[PDB]
Amino acid sequence: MVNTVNYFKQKLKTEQQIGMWVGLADGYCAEIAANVGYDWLLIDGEHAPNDVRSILAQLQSIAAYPSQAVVRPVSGDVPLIKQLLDIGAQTLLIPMVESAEQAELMVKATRYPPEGIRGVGAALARASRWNNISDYLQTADEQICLLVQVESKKGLDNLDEILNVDGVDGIFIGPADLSAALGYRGNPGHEFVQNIIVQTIQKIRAAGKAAGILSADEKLAKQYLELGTEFVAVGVDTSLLMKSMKQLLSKFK
Amino acid sequence: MVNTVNYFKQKLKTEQQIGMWVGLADGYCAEIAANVGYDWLLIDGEHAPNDVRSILAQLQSIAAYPSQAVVRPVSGDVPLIKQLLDIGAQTLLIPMVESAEQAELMVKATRYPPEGIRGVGAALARASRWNNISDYLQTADEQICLLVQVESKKGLDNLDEILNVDGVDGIFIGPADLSAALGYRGNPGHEFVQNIIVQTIQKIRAAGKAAGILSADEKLAKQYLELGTEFVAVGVDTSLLMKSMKQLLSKFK
Amino acid sequence: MVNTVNYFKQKLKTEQQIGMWVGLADGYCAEIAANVGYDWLLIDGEHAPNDVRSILAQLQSIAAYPSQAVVRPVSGDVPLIKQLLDIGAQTLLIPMVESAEQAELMVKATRYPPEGIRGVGAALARASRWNNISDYLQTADEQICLLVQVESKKGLDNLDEILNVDGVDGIFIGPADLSAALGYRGNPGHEFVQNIIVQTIQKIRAAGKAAGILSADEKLAKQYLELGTEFVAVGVDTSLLMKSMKQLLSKFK
Amino acid sequence: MVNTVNYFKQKLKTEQQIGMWVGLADGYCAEIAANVGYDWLLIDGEHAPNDVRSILAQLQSIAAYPSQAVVRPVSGDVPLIKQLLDIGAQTLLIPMVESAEQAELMVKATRYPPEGIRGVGAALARASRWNNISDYLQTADEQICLLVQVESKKGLDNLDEILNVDGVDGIFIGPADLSAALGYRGNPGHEFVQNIIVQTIQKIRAAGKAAGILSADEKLAKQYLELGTEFVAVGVDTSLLMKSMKQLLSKFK
Amino acid sequence: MVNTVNYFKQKLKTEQQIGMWVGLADGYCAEIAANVGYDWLLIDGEHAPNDVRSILAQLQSIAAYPSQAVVRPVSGDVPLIKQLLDIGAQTLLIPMVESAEQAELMVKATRYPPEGIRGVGAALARASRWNNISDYLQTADEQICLLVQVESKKGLDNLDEILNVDGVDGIFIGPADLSAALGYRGNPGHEFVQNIIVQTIQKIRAAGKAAGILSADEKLAKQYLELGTEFVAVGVDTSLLMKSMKQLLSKFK
Amino acid sequence: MVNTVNYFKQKLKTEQQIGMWVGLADGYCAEIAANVGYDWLLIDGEHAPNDVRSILAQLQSIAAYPSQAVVRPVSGDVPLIKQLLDIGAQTLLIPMVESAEQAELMVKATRYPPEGIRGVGAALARASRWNNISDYLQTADEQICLLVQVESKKGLDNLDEILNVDGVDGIFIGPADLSAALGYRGNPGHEFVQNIIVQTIQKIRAAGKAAGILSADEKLAKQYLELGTEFVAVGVDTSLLMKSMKQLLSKFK
Ligand SMILES: O=C(O)C(=O)C[C@@H](O)[C@H](O)CO
Ligand SMILES: O=C(O)C(=O)C[C@@H](O)[C@H](O)CO
Ligand SMILES: [Ca+2]
Ligand SMILES: [Ca+2]
Ligand SMILES: [Zn+2]
């Protein structure tokens, strides 16, 4: 067996990938989402009630389908990053990255020694298919994709420095955390917030990195795609489930 | 503590209750459904991957909300009925009921001896809140609601007989099983099927029982409500999740 | 490795075994109970929310401790009996046994062919420790203990016939189901019910079988032990947890 | 999406498929087995501690790999068969089938009405991918494969009658159950048993059905393959795990 | 829907709340505790085997009852605090708080930016009921209650400083950790320890904060209530389960 | 009850203990491993998908058998160490220890105050059997065994300083991590690496500490045992499961 190709990573330079947030925290729900045809699914370990074992179940469900899995850990925790890579998550989205130094540590956390600090345990890892991928320790690093979130003032204050870090494949803008940080909590649609988001997208792409974002607003999402934003999540399973059930009930009250 | 009042059961005689099918087989998904404001939630033990323990988790989730829980067991199995009643399911929907004799056995399965055959284990039961409901063994039978599905030719062949069974509170028409039984598998909307469903609804109400049905078709659901159908499910969580994610992706392909 | 000796089965003829009902349906709770020093623990698959997998977890927890595990299936279901024997339950308590014919089928359900109908799958079974007990298929039958519950009028109407069945090691009286069957639901303490229980215990022991019973009433439990009742459960974990927490709160209201 | 093609079913007529028993009852263990390259994996619901939910997890694990899943229910229970088909098991192995009448009921249990009695619930089923397989109710029956076990004297007494049942795709011989039934429990290797197995394989293939068998004995497995046996399981994960760990320890004692 | 009112938080100023420690780490056990009528339940993420997902199940169980849930995380970890707030824990008890700077960080960890560092993910959170609480991002901070444990010498060395932190609603004294820190491990009842606890309670109340404590000792608990201690836990479910089963067995040995 | 004697800890000074890596992350798989007769089983919380709750299940499985449990946390995290000790893990293997200061903190993390910083919660702990071990707070420290991994250049740069830390019972060499650190990733067999391992084992034993190592290579494992290495793991369950199933398939292709 050859290592699983990270098509999400390759497509960062060839197309615009449409994403779905997966926070139902469940193998069975993850599989329903996997049947739709999204370019990528974000398994949310930060804002959905997930742990390593529930993320593994969802990776196993999604693996039969073409949708590419991206995992968001709760934080940029080196040992948690090790755990998520070994269950075979090939793309990670690190929340609240605020310096070149933190971004550099996240790069190393995804690469084997001697160049990185990823803990070595290939005999035990779904990532290596328990060494059924015979050359995994040689081919692993190339199919790993690192995304970092800029979603705070300090993040924006260190944007040019983060964009200079080799091994950061993409910067993803978090409008909820960023609008809150800017004193517009719950109102990311405000012009003050949107002008910073557009400028930020433009700066990311000018430094040769992939830009990403989440908006459940169809107009905002289409605007980001027109700017050339490489990875755009367009909704959230929890939100779509709630809204679809409320919209149906309102037809009958 | 006084026994939980079965408002679903009381409302069978006073209003038309709007229902949502719950097949996501998950305590967390069940809570999302419970927040919407449906009159009733059908926790599907027949066609979703549920067991007693997953049904228990969903009852615990829904219990904090006004939505009334109805549980469908995989079949009219007396021991399984016993199990679902003790975890505190107060309304049961029995699939594929086909004679007065089977409906009578389902009535007895829901009532304590000496009048019924419900196994007695109140010290262990969430149903009694582990005897924190001090008179549960006296007050239980009153708050239990039995619904039976007519969804086969034999069922329609025994409809008058089933409708004469004291203890059957409601008959629910299953259009998927019934359309298939009639040789119109996948096409319940056909006039042949619909005329039999309308006639069946009319006969159920004429015998003083509650009539129920599921249709994801808004026009068919509104027609059944106009006929006075007492319990009408209008959608399915798995269906709404899939459709909502597909509809969103189609805006971006 | 030699097959696990069924000390519960042996002690039926040498002493009076004190039992604790286990309906918290949980490996961790089962282990707390296992630390107390009961002669036997009844893992309740009839009135607690248990399935094969949760009973297995509790068997694994209890196995490190001297307390002997007894499992009650939801019903006298031959395939469920097969499943519970293979995860390594060596003593079963069958509810609602009402004839010599049903008791004879329960005997066969616990024994390998050609004499019985227990399904053969020793390579897969914790019971054989996955064939690490090298002669399991030869030594299994001898360490299996069958108990049947008499707890209905029909049971009492067939008591002499059930007591004549070879391979029934014990008859256990269920006061909750029996008092309900006799039209004294919730009032097993009534003289009418108690005189039948005492006579029943006396008849069981006169036929050379072990008698068993559950009472949370200390006086009734001590009376049953004075009659020579071989296996007496004296409480229920759910009941003791609820009562201990209520009794503590009442000191502070 | 088109219905998942049952390659196991097709290959019954074109090749000899090498099988592995999966009794570790675990999504993660099922995936390790799926990486090896077995033609088919038997998820054992009869002699491993599995339920609908654990079988679902294992189907989800295995689905990303070419190995075809076969599921053995605990018995020929029509409602359990309905549950396993809806979670998306396309090939079932029914234990202890002993008459043409039982084999006919198993055929019907696997097919939609009006021809069969499979309960209809495509909107909820992983089988239909929640109706993302748009014509599932029309294409389902074709990709379902029914196997029945002959592993008792009464089975052998009804072999010709079972082999005349249209809809039985294969007969699988269970040497553990069959050797016990014949009074050679634990000794299937005996000439008395082996002559009956060989004759039975010959009869199965002469009636135009696929023959199958399990043997962990390499010599017996190769002999069965030389006779033309269509589906041959050659080992059991629990057995291989135990034996590999025992053999390694013995090198160091 | 309006945000869930934190009655625990309001009652810190109006009454003395009686608490029960919940360490059975189980949705079902948590519901049993919820039925008793305790003012508050401490779901222990520090000293019982809990994770985010097991704490979620226990919150869902307890939510149908008046008892207010308080969650103790394993440590004052900002990302874990974020996770427990989003699953909807409205009161946190932070162990081993030892400086004003740590207490200030715990205040910020519980509040949204720009004033705090709580991660924003309301679309995914049970806390917001998945935005069914429409103004959650405006009303959240008000219903969050922060408690900190003083249970070390350094904690006592920084008590005046911690008590001057705005946003700390309560200080909880941990007698096990504090007695151990003072060189009286296992003997909190010693006058040396008790004099420091009473003095500490008095200082907490003098600074206008709520004081709290756990003691399974009825006399010590009543003494702490007589001093005006605002939140007093009086027992532990694991302890009461073990003691109740031991006391019962001793009546029969 | 007296505290569970740590025989692994005692045998570090009296014999050479043969070990098996347990990375199947499963109570049921842990029990199969426990039946074989390994001196010690390493429950891998660093490179297998385990959390506190899955490690608890595996401790409960293994507890009925003589094999001694050793638990590897994902990192040297003081609060996680507290959690694993309270569920009753008596021997910990800390990964990637790189200084005397880190090794000292790990010693303190394993001992109660006042000498250590282990959080005190005996009433809730499987470790104390919920205080059924009456003197646990006095006898705990004695039966706890601390092992640290040297598996990086900085570890080797601090070997003499680590080996002078009182409370470090053993140093375990990780050849996967160490060979990667040395620029020989996937090739621990190289003379450059092996000479450093041998020298390292010699230094460990010369400082009076127990030396340990993992090798699936029988020749390397026997060489390490000939050098006097006190604890030698000789294989990995995931690796043995995969290899056994691959070797069997190859006989039939
Ligand atoms: O040798 C090492 O570094 C270890 O500590 C552990 C083990 O997980 C190996 O990585 C297996 O591949
Ligand atoms: O051979 C048989 O009878 C089988 O059907 C199955 C298998 O479970 C064996 O019993 C393994 O011991
Ligand atoms: Ca289950
Ligand atoms: Ca978990
Ligand atoms: Zn964010």
Ligand SMILES: [Zn+2]
């Ligand atoms: Zn139906």
Ligand SMILES: [Zn+2]
């Ligand atoms: Zn009973």
Ligand SMILES: [Zn+2]
């Ligand atoms: Zn068989």
Ligand SMILES: [Zn+2]
């Ligand atoms: Zn404490």
Ligand SMILES: [Zn+2]
């Ligand atoms: Zn290592």
